[PDB]
Design a protein around this ligand. Structure first.
Ligand SMILES: CN(c1ccccc1C(=O)Nc1ccc(S(=O)(=O)N2CCN(c3cc(Cl)cc(Cl)c3)CC2)cc1)S(C)(=O)=O
Ligand SMILES: CN(c1ccccc1C(=O)Nc1ccc(S(=O)(=O)N2CCN(c3cc(Cl)cc(Cl)c3)CC2)cc1)S(C)(=O)=O
Ligand SMILES: [Mn+2]
Ligand SMILES: [Mn+2]
Ligand SMILES: [Mn+2]
Ligand SMILES: [Mn+2]
Lengths: 231, 231
């Protein structure tokens, strides 16, 4: 199967989640055709030059997957939009655009983090628009690391709005798909809807905390799977 | 794996759900070690003498699973507590008590429909207590079929309360388990909790409508899986 995960929100303060992720990478992921990480892999990102040991540990673990013959891909989330080409190289991941149609076993599937669908959160969308400006990213990344951390602390100190259903249909009609997989909203579920005047499905991943979750796609099956961290 | 499903609420008026169930029985179920149906297989049951064609269709489909070498088991729900030894024989299913500990790959797992945990719904628990009296079941079943239908229509005409968390811990301590699988509440989820002063897990199945759901247990994994009806 092809696997999709999102919303791991990895951080030093939550080692149980990291352990769960390492188990997933060392086991489940090795049997996959490909692995797609649809954003919020990390709880925060202020640049690829950050010496946070968790980053290099995760890079090595993800690179082990692609080195074993399982291609890995990443779409940015709202937490980790500054994850860059250096980390992608270190982790063996291919960076994808914010919205991407895959051809999976003949099925067209739209993938994204999901935050672009949450059009009712005006405050979040204003934030997203600003921090996605390349010139501002470049300027931020040019600050001293210690300053970026001070900004981050305040910004992190400074409930996730669910998707707008019209935005969902709009996106699925734009991309001409009957399948959409995303995360962001932390509301794991399978939804049936109508797009392109045909039955359509939206499959939502969950955040990693007590459980992990993944979506498995094969030719004949699409499954949303939750698993507790019980090892 | 060993499979668990619940809350299919099968009825003539919802053929899409029946089709989804037939696909599950003809495919997924055949690969299983065993199949456990944890109640609310049917939307209603007024006795095994009911000539509803759906009942015989489902009996044949379930019996095909056990005849292929996959043992099937049933725990009653609140909808189908009158499902009896005749239907069990016709369907090749073994009837289990309302609460049962399984030994699955060395792991003790408590299974039940889930309604016994919903102790905050006084009206439901009063109903359950009365209709579980064997003498009343026997008397009801002795009514003419057409009368049972008239009673049923009114009773069906006459939101599901979630579990009581204390009832959960109580049950898991009573049965000395760290794992519980149930349905009834139509809130599919994986929960972590504490029972027997140790980490415990409660895995909840969902109702069948737009999606099906199952729990898969192997030696190393416990998974809650949702799948859309997309065939
Ligand atoms: C949904 N989320 C939001 C809702 C509303 C508004 C914002 C968010 C949100 O994602 N905030 C958020 C996202 C990431 C981060 S961070 O990784 O610490 N970091 C990202 C990089 N930042 C940054 C980027 C630019 Cl180019 C310019 C500047 Cl000066 C600063 C600093 C903050 C800090 C905060 S939430 C509740 O999860 O925070
Ligand atoms: C959670 N549910 C309840 C909540 C509160 C109270 C009751 C229920 C509930 O399960 N009701 C319910 C359950 C089954 C059925 S039924 O299958 O049509 N049928 C079952 C058999 N009945 C019956 C049994 C005895 Cl031995 C005596 C009598 Cl004279 C009657 C008739 C009704 C009809 C109604 S819910 C909302 O799903 O109905
Ligand atoms: Mn997230
Ligand atoms: Mn997000
Ligand atoms: Mn039910
Ligand atoms: Mn029930």
């Amino acid at each position: 199967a092809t696997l999709f995960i999102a919303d791991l929100h990895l951080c030093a303060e939550e080692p149980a989640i990291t352990a769960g992720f390492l188990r997933f990478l060392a086991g489940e992921a090795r049997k996959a055709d490909a692995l797609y990480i649809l954003g919020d892999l990390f709880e925060a990102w202020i640049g690829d030059d950050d010496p946070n040991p968790l980053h290099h540990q995760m890079a090595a673990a993800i690179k082990a997957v692609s080195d074993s013959g399982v291609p890995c891909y990443f779409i940015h989330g709202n937490r980790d939009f500054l994850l860059g080409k250096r980390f992608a190289r270190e982790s063996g991941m291919t960076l994808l655009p914010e919205e991407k149609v895959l051809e999976l076993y003949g099925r067209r599937v739209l993938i994204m983090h999901g935050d672009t669908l949450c059009t009712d959160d005006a405050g979040y969308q204003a934030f997203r628009a600003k921090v996605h400006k390349p010139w501002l990213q470049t300027l931020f990344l040019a600050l001293p690391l210690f300053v970026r951390k001070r900004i981050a602390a305040r910004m992190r100190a400074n409930a996730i709005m669910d998707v707008n259903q019209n935005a969902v249909v709009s996106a699925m009609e734009k991309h001409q798909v009957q399948w959409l997989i995303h995360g962001h909203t932390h509301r794991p579920a399978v939804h049936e809807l109508i797009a392109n005047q045909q039955t359509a499905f939206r499959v939502v991943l969950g955040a990693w905390h007590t459980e992990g979750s993944m979506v498995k796609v094969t030719a004949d099956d699409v499954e949303l799977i939750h698993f507790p961290f019980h090892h």
